[PDB]
Amino acid sequence: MGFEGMFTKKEGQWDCSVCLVRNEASATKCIACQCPSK
């Protein structure tokens, strides 16, 4: 068996292209590094 989507991205989340932290849909900038959403 694989990882069974145990840690899959939730609906609307996006990964920061600068620091790879996972952000919520409503976040316009990364919660960690503050870089604007791609």
Binding site: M1, G2, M6, F7, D15, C19, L20, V21
Partner: protein, 200 residues
């Protein structure tokens, strides 16, 4: 599918954090610098019997002391490695300080304690003296970054804890920088036994 975890690598300056993370060659070639936080994020892929796992290892660019890292450093940290230098007792004295600074922001995340530079025979923080805890989310390993000794051990233990699979295995070792020093096999055998009895 591939899973992804943020791993914060912290510890006193000069303990070998950068030397350690840079052993993973692909993670070095694909590292990402975060200017606003003074951090290099190394995406370390490990291939398990259940698929690939990527540890995004956060390695500071400076010499910050405990409590001196920008707040964004710990944000969304899902696991951690606290490193010290077995030839410098002060770096081990500060391990509880880093642990306190980490748990203040992240609370209950799996953490591995790593004593680096065990290739140096004049070891000041001896295996017997390692303070061990009853915590299920804390584990210790000797490591020697320059010899790749036990390089995969912290990541395998974290992967098993995060996935919840004690039988998880790495089907192949990642491409690692060639060893620059030799880890004495007799010392390795003696250290490994000393840590077994101390943990139990």
């Amino acid at each position: 599918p591939q899973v992804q975890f943020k791993l914060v690598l912290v510890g006193d300056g000069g303990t070998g954090k950068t030397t350690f993370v840079k052993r993973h060659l692909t993670g070095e070639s694909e590292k990402k610098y975060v200017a606003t936080l003074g951090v290099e994020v190394h995406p370390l892929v490990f291939h398990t019997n259940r698929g690939p796992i990527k540890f995004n290892v956060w390695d500071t660019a400076g010499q910050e002391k405990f409590g001196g890292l920008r707040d964004g450093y710990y944000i969304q940290a899902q696991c951690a490695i606290i490193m010290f230098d077995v030839t410098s007792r002060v770096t081990y004295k500060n391990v509880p300080n880093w642990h306190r600074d980490l748990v203040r922001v992240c609370e209950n995340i799996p953490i591995v304690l790593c004593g680096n530079k065990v290739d140096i025979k004049d070891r000041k923080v001896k295996a017997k003296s390692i303070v061990f805890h009853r915590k299920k989310n804390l584990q210790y390993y000797d490591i020697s970054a320059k010899s790749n000794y036990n390089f995969e051990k912290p990541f395998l233990w974290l992967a098993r804890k995060l996935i919840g699979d004690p039988n998880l295995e790495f089907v192949a070792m990642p491409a690692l920088a060639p060893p620059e020093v030799v880890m004495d096999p007799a010392l390795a055998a003696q250290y490994e036994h000393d840590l077994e009895v101390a943990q139990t």
